[PDB]
Amino acid sequence: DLGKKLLEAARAGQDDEVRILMANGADVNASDADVGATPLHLAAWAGHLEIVEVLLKTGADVNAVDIWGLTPLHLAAAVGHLEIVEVLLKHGADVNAQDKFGKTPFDLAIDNGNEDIAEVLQKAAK
Amino acid sequence: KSIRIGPGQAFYAXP
Ligand SMILES: [Cl-]
Ligand SMILES: [Cl-]
Ligand SMILES: [Mg+2]
Ligand SMILES: [Mg+2]
């Protein structure tokens, strides 16, 4: 299962393994069979900037959603990875995306005390 | 486990 190996490599921050798996047939837009999460979701949550950048370069959907309605921007804003938030926004991440409960990335930044990210997102929503 | 993310924590956590 090349797709699942790519998800796990992104989750684990294994940059070389991510690049090798894709060159070897793994789909940059692979998704988990049960919850729909993509490699970019996992890299944004786990905080691996270089993997985020290579997935985007290779064609990852910046606005992919999982079964809870979470986008990569939701995940990075929740954990508090400012540089990843900025990269995602630069690549067209939807600042107004609502999860299954109506929550935006800004809402998750607020809930997790990530005020610098919250300010970035508030200003991008202007 | 400290990150307030909702039910999706089941898949992502981690912290
Ligand atoms: Cl995984
Ligand atoms: Cl922050
Ligand atoms: Mg690293
Ligand atoms: Mg704070």
The three-state DSSP-derived secondary structure of chain A is CHHHHHHHHHHCCCHHHHHHHHHCCCCCCCCCCCCCCCHHHHHHHHCCHHHHHHHHHHCCCCCCCCCCCCCHHHHHHHHCCHHHHHHHHHCCCCCCCCCCCCCCHHHHHHHCCCHHHHHHHHHHCC
Experiment used for this model: X-ray
Interface touch A79/B7, C-beta < 8 Å: no
For the four alpha carbons of A70, A38, A48 and A14, in that order, the dihedral sign comes to positive
Measured CA to CA, the distance from residue A64 to residue A91 in angstroms comes to 13
Q: 3-state DSSP call for residue B9?
A: helix
Angle, helix A72-79 to helix A115-124, in steps of 10 degrees: 140
Structure tokens at B9: 């924590």
Q: Between chains, do B11 and A66 touch, taking CB under 8 Å as contact?
A: yes
A68 close to B (CB below 8 A):
yes
Resolution in A: 1.4
Q: How far is CA A76 from CA A21, A57, A117, A123, in A?
A: 23, 18, 9, 17
Give A63 Cα–ligand 4 centroid separation in angstroms. 26
Calculate the alpha carbon distances from A83 to A3, A18, A44, A67, A121 in Å.
26, 20, 10, 25, 13
Q: Cα(A66)–Cα(A52) distance, rounded to whole angstroms?
A: 17
**Nearest C-alpha in A relative to B3:** A79
